Amino acid sequence: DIQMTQSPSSLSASVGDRVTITCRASQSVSSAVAWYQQKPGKAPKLLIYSASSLYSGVPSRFSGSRSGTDFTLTISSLQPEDFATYYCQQSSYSLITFGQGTKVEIKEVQLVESGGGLVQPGGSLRLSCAASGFNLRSYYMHWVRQAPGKGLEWVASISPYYSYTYYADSVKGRFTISADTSKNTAYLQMNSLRAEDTAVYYCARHGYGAMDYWGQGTLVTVS
Amino acid sequence: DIQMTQSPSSLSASVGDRVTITCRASQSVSSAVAWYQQKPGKAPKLLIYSASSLYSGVPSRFSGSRSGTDFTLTISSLQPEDFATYYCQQSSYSLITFGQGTKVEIKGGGGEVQLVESGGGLVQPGGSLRLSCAASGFNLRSYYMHWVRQAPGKGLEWVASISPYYSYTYYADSVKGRFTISADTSKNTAYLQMNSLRAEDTAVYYCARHGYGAMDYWGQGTLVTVSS
Amino acid sequence: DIQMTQSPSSLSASVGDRVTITCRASQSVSSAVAWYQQKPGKAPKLLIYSASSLYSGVPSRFSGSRSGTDFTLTISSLQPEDFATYYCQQSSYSLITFGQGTKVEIKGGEVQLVESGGGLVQPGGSLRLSCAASGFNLRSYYMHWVRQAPGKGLEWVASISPYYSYTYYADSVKGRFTISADTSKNTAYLQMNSLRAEDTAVYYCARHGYGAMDYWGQGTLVTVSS
Amino acid sequence: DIQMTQSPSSLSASVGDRVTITCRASQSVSSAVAWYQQKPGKAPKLLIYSASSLYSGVPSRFSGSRSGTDFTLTISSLQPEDFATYYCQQSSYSLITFGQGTKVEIKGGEVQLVESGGGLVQPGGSLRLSCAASGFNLRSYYMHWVRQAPGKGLEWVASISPYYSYTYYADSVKGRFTISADTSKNTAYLQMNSLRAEDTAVYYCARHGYGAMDYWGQGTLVTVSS
Ligand SMILES: [Cl-]
Ligand SMILES: [Cl-]
Ligand SMILES: [Cl-]
Ligand SMILES: [Cl-]
Ligand SMILES: [Cl-]
Ligand SMILES: [Cl-]
Ligand SMILES: [Cl-]
Ligand code: NA
Ligand code: NA
């Protein structure tokens, strides 16, 4: 006797923004509505119960309202730890249902990797890393990869202005790192692809004998 | 002077949803605020002016609001032609400014038939790519699946097809020996392996489902650029 | 074993006109002919299949015919939303082919803006963009230039006032761009000097109205690179 | 010419704890050591560089140390946002390497729910899930099972009432699943019969509080596949 339709299914905002998520109750309506937050890999956490009551310990920028059939969760000033999937729940005397969930996502120096995908062993693949906010000719750039569930593994680096290259032993003679200064883009040319190459591939900018700026990564699955 | 901050920068929604987009004026405020809709490849179109006046011909499901510095565009029930990017605009007596834009994208989609291509990108001649087409709302095991491509400013060109239950493949002469079509029923996904790419392969690649001796459902397409 | 020759490749018509598009099957023939509509930036949409069957949800003003090797798509009364490109498809048991397409386009009285002059230059180069207006007296309105870098948002560039040609510029183009207008020719211009890579964008010209921009041109692409 | 060995591979701690992570350079050694934090599904963030320099905007509770070959990251007082995986990095003039990583995990308050029994079955098979409760009397609360298919949303499965053991079921599992409890042993159960591919999911146990579900277990994975 209850049904909840949640909107939007995802949204991207910036830190400090005001975000609203709606759940429309299209059958029986009551105030027995709760909101949950779920971080990737973890169980849900209760935010609000009885449609508008703040759960003990939950920060005050979360609040809930009901107007007619519409229940709304408002995050008043979005914080970096707020990025998660949010669910509404409605309860009747006989049933419980959940809305479909809303993914809330983040977003100056910027790096964007592309090129990943599901690929066949033995073939070749080019990865790209598009830089903005800086001239990557003036920086060492790095590729670092991470197989699923495993650690960071440095793959290759290329030097500023002279394009000297450095490689991990594990990819030497198979991978070539390069860059197009005119396009402010760095590249990774992967040859003779194999199962160990399955990984998220990150591009990172050198600073301080370290890597201070990272892209979000592109997934390469070899199968 | 004026400055506008638009949020969210993007949202995904479904047909029937009520969607709200905010623009905060951080300086001078008047009700001289307008909203525009822009579709890909197209000029912007005016939706609302003077913060709440609907422009002639715009559907009544679009409304504009103001509360202090906060201006809002509301779509009361999202329709399939509403997926676009939206911009607010503020005018002063000496300056014009726009918000950064909000993209409204289609969600995915439930039990509705949907095709989503991916894998496009820029490659040098001789390079290779593998396109994927992820199906939702139906099992591609039961249907012929097609790839069709369109070079910029040119016509539709059939690329390849793959049959159900038997995996028989069919290719245009222009890609024989270079492209391979396949399907993975367990992932409900079709693929186009593209080897030995040349400049003339530059195009938007669409995946399409067979129905009625025709192609009844189509993806949004993925762009492939082959350039030296 | 199939081949489709589609005619015409383009045509100009008015709302309310009857429009017909033909595809001749030059090789084997069957009833397996379909017709599609495609609008700029969108995937094709199926209109008719098996030469004459109307696809669910398509308006009845669309119909498909066949006489011999010739298949025809008829739009009994063109509506504003029908301006688009149309394609026939033919299938055999071994092949699919598409006709080359027919663009159905609009032809007075209506407000129109048409930008031109875009092109590719090196940093430090220059271009003059022009915006030809019809349907209204450009001298009576504020005219604007707005640009959009690829993948990015709209950015106001410059405005010119009616009757007095007072000019207004965004800070990013001050001292480099000049807006002007020839009212006797109903054309606005954007002289773009000292170009830099960040000026790369589609440039639109827009008419002022209601404190906003009610009519825009289709834009002209400017690319600056070394 | 460089190699880092990181320990522990994982540790469990509470908010307010002092926590230390060690990386031993077993080959050439220098001050060129950095520390990174990474949260699930996100890129690493730089914390410390040159073994002891705090990157701009990193809280002062993070500090880095060196004793000979051993490099140590210390979090003086663990905060909720610090539960993450941490990595050390060493650079030479020719190579970069990373430690194997340290997962820093929350310990468990008094309330715990622990699901077990998840596993792999063929369509038509059966499983019994267990939910062990501690820190509260299960007899006095509604208990719920809620599941989540990979990359999808929460779906309520079943609930059982306190003191009278009334049961409630989702339509999608009616006639296949049975929820039960053993109050004397503080355990709830979900018997899952006649399984199908669509039942594949992480299954959570949850305690009723305030008309909602105030405590959740970490869930147990069920995979149904031919
Ligand atoms: Cl190499
Ligand atoms: Cl490939
Ligand atoms: Cl060929
Ligand atoms: Cl003809
Ligand atoms: Cl019909
Ligand atoms: Cl009609
Ligand atoms: Cl005007
Ligand atoms: Na010139
Ligand atoms: Na059932």
Author numbering:
A (entry chain C): 1 to 107, 113 to 215, 216A, 217 to 228
B (entry chain A): 1 to 107, 109 to 215, 216A, 217 to 229
C (entry chain B): 1 to 107, 111 to 215, 216A, 217 to 229
D (entry chain D): 1 to 108, 112 to 215, 216A, 217 to 229
Task: Please give sentences taken from the publication describing this entry.
Erythropoietin (EPO) initiates EPO receptor (EPOR) signaling in hematopoietic cells by binding to an asymmetric EPOR dimer through two different sites. Activation of erythropoiesis is dependent on an asymmetric dimer of the erythropoietin receptor (EPOR) formed by engagement of a single EPO molecule on erythroid cells. We engineered dimeric diabody‐Fc (Db‐Fc) fusion proteins that appeared to act as potent agonists of human EPOR in cell proliferation assays. Instead, a minor oligomeric form, identified as a putative tetrabody (Tb) fused to two Fc domains (Tb‐Fc2), proved to be the minimal active form.
To better understand the basis for VL–VH oligomerization and activity, we produced VL–VH 1.1 without an Fc domain. However, VL–VH 1.1 alone crystallized readily in space group P21 and we were able to solve the structure at 2.06 Å resolution with an R free of 21.2%. The asymmetric unit contained four VL–VH chains, and superposition revealed definitive linkages between the VL and VH domains (<15 Å apart) and showed that each presents a distinct conformation owing to the flexible linker. The 4 chains within the asymmetric unit form 2 Dbs (chains 1/2 and chains 3/4) held together by 2 conventional VL/VH interfaces in each, and the two Dbs pack with each other through unconventional VL/VL and VH/VH interfaces (between chains 2/3) to form a Tb with four antigen‐binding sites arranged asymmetrically ~59–68 Å apart. Thus, all four sites of the Tb appear to be capable of EPOR engagement. Furthermore, each Db forms non‐covalent dimers with the other Db in the Tb (i.e., chains 2/3 and chains 1/4) through unconventional VL/VL and VH/VH interfaces. Thus, the Tb quaternary structure is dominated by the light chain self‐association that combines the two Dbs into the Tb complex. The composite interface results in a combined total buried surface area of 759 Å2, but unlike the hydrophobic VL/VH interactions, the VL/VL and VH/VH interactions are largely mediated by polar contacts. Analysis of the VL/VL interface revealed an extensive and largely symmetric hydrogen bond network between β‐strand 1b of each light chain — including residues Ser9L, Ser10L, Leu11L, and Ser12L — and further supported by hydrogen bonds and van der Waals contacts made by Ala107L and Asp17L with Ser7L (Figure 9i(i)). Thus, the formation of the Db is dictated predominantly by hydrophobic interactions nearly identical to those involved in the highly favorable association of the 4D5 Fv, and this likely represents the first step in asymmetric Tb formation.
